[PDB]
Paper text:
We have been exploring the use of Cry3Aa protein crystals produced in Bacillus thuringiensis (Bt) for multiple applications. The unique biological self-assembly properties of the Cry3Aa protein enable the direct immobilization of functional proteins by genetic fusion or the entrapment of co-expressed protein targets within the Cry3Aa lattice in a fashion that stabilizes the immobilized protein against thermal and solvent denaturation. Here, we report the generation of mechano-responsive PEI-modified Cry3Aa protein crystals and their use for NADH recycling over multiple reaction cycles. We have developed a mechanoresponsive polyethylenimine-modified Cry3Aa (PEI-3A) crystal that enables the versatile and long-term recycling of NADH in an approach that is simple to operate.
Given that the more positively charged Pos3Aa crystals bound NADH better than Cry3Aa crystals (11.2 ± 0.7 and 6 ± 2 μmol/g, respectively), we decided to explore the use of protein cationization to improve NADH binding by incorporating the highly positively charged and flexible PEI polymer into the crystal. PEI-3A crystals were produced by incubating Cry3Aa crystals with PEI in the presence of EDC/NHS. To elucidate the impact of PEI-cationization on the structure of the Cry3Aa crystals, we took advantage of the fact that in vitro-produced Cry3Aa crystals have the same space group and unit cell as the crystals produced in Bt. The crystal structure also gave no evidence of an ordered PEI monomer or specific residue for PEI attachment, suggesting that, while the PEI molecules bind to the Asp and Glu residues within the nanochannels of the crystal, they are anchored randomly. Similar to what was observed with the Cry3Aa crystals produced in vivo, confocal microscopy confirmed the labeling of PEI and binding of NADH throughout the in vitro-grown PEI-Cry3Aa crystals. Notably, PEI-cationization of Cry3Aa crystals was highly effective in promoting high levels of NADH binding (540 ± 6 μmol/g) —an amount that we hypothesized should be sufficient for facilitating NADH-dependent enzyme reactions. We speculate that the nanochannels of the Cry3Aa crystals and the nature of the interior of the channel provide an optimal environment for the binding of PEI and, subsequently, NADH.
Numbering used by the authors: 61 to 644
């Protein structure tokens, strides 16, 4: 269900993570001609973004409104196309071309496009349909910002005056805040409009939350990296959040025997440090069928093990989920492997009184970065497997379908839960996946700006917990409630010529505070940081400030430990990311 927008939704975030920050000008047109075919070739990509949010909501956009949202996304096609053609010429054309004629021509093109976005946008926010338009609003907003930054890059070359540029800069700032906050507000509103009580309500809920994460929340997460003044190099970053695929079922209609809403959501992975899949212990049962044929074996329960982010290796293993095994147990080991796909068989037995569905087979496609070669590891119920009915590609497509899927995939499996049906009529398993952009090693690039999310810390102290991020950070954040050391993340430098660095940190504090950075316990950076919220406040874009440390430093260590002081009682610090700016 939905691979049309959910593919364009992952190509755009997968394509935008290269030209994010200050793109080496050659990659900024190597991007924009992918983005003109992904999101702006016709109005076929824009009438799908609508009918996707419509499907998750069971409500309609009227017809006196579903049009003027397409009449504008045509308006914006040309503009954006025409600007990119012009900009591409500008890039190629040797500087013995840059006469006053072509200057004010690209100038007018950029001004056209940017002008038009500013006129269009409220069309994607009309009162009453803000949720249904959300993806359209997002993809547009994202083209508008990504457009606006070009004024900073080429402004002088095109002959815009100091003011002209600086007026664009203030607009990019205000719109980055307004666009982001709009998207979180209305995402949550829609999400809430879908909580219910049945397994049925839940799958719609989760399908909304998955698809909105891929085609909205992942997109806004990159909006502050279009500020090329604050990010004047290329940025190395990652999305740390979870997504759960739809559950694996042998029937469309479970007739109210699916696990209740409360029984799934209150029991899925709560905000946690980042980890990677380590082990799955499959548990198979026997399903006596109506005849000496349909009787089969089904995946009924499991354990899960996951290995924590780098710095620790002492593993985690889950409670038992589901029912214990009546055939022998199967173990697959996933150390060092990245499970870029999952395909599954299901099967059912029709009984005069009831139906019994199960998952009989799951084949796990996987890849290996330590030693470049792809493989498969499979699970077999060992009795009447049936046919494949569930393909994770249909929900987590690849970034691009150019390369083979083990290079161009978009997600790797993180976690496998097993939920029991009502009146043990089966087990429904649920798969959790993370983004391919995550780096196991926590590498600090030597040419680029590096963003290290505090959820990649391997260890938390002084009563520092992991908290639901505010939807625009790309994941969660660390919550400090106490003075003293709060988080410890392991860190991989890429050279050993003493490459000096400056640090910034992206936080939100209720009071003024002091951050201490250390390496292997040696403290190497401290400074005072400004208040940014009042107690009780709900965290919007402006809640988080991004502030530099005074002193350059080298990465002669691996164990970054972050500490907070200044908290009175009832204070909160929220830490999102730590940044590394390579220096001279």
């Amino acid at each position: 269900t939905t691979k049309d927008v959910i593919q364009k939704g992952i190509s755009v975030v997968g394509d935008l993570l290269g030209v994010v920050g200050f793109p080496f000008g050659g990659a900024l047109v190597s991007f924009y001609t992918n983005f003109l075919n992904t999101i702006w070739p016709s109005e076929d990509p824009w009438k799908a973004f609508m009918e996707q949010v419509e499907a998750l909501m069971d409500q309609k956009i009227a017809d006196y409104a579903k049009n003027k949202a397409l009449a504008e996304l045509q308006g914006l096609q040309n503009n954006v196309e025409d600007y990119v053609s012009a900009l591409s010429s500008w890039q190629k054309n040797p500087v013995s071309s840059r006469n006053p004629h072509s200057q004010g021509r690209i100038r007018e093109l950029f001004s056209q496009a940017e002008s038009h976005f500013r006129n269009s946008m409220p069309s994607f926010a009309i009162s009453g349909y803000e949720v249904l338009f959300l993806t359209t609003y997002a993809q547009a907003a994202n083209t508008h910002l990504f457009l606006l930054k070009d004024a900073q890059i080429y402004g002088e070359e095109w002959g815009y005056e100091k003011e002209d540029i600086a007026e664009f800069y203030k607009r990019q700032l205000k719109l980055t805040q307004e666009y982001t906050d709009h998207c979180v507000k209305w995402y949550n509103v829609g999400l809430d409009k879908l909580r219910g009580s049945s397994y049925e309500s839940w799958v719609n809920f989760n399908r909304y939350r998955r698809e909105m994460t891929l085609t909205v929340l992942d997109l806004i997460a990159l909006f502050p990296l279009y500020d090329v003044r604050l990010y004047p190099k290329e940025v190395k970053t990652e999305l740390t959040r979870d997504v759960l695929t739809d559950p694996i079922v042998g029937v469309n209609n479970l007739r109210g025997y699916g696990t209740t809403f409360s029984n799934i959501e209150n029991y899925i992975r709560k905000p946690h440090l980042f980890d990677y899949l380590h082990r799955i212990q499959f548990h198979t049962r026997f399903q006596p069928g109506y005849y000496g044929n349909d009787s089969f074996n089904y995946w009924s329960g499991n354990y899960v093990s996951t290995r924590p982010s780098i710095g620790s290796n002492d593993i985690i293993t889950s409670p038992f989920y589901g029912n214990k095994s009546s055939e022998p147990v199967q173990n697959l080991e996933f150390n060092g492997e990245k499970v870029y796909r999952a395909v599954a068989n299901t099967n059912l037995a029709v009984w005069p009184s009831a139906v019994y569905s199960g998952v009989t087979k799951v084949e796990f496609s996987q890849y290996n970065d330590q030693t470049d070669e792809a493989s498969t590891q499979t699970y077999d119920s060992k009795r009447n497997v049936g046919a494949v009915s569930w393909d994770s590609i249909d929900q987590l497509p690849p970034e691009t379908t150019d390369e083979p899927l083990e290079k161009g995939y978009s997600h790797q499996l993180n976690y496998v839960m097993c939920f029991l049906m009502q009146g043990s009529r089966g087990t429904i398993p649920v798969l959790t996946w993370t983004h391919k952009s995550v780096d196991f090693f926590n590498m600090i690039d030597s040419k680029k700006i590096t963003q290290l999310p505090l959820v990649k810390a391997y260890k938390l102290q002084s009563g520092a917990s992991v908290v639901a991020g505010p939807r625009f950070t790309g994941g969660d954040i660390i919550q400090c409630t106490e003075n003293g050391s709060a988080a410890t993340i392991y860190v991989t430098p890429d050279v050993s010529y003493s490459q000096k660095y400056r640090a910034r940190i992206h936080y939100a504090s209720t009071s003024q505070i002091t951050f201490t950075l250390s390496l292997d316990g040696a403290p190497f950076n401290q400074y005072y940081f400004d208040k940014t919220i009042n107690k009780g406040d709900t965290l919007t874009y402006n809640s988080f400030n991004l502030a530099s440390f005074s002193t350059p430093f080298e990465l002669s260590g691996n164990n970054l430990q972050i500490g907070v002081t200044g908290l009175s009682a009832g204070d909160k610090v929220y830490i999102d990311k730590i940044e590394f700016i390579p220096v001279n």
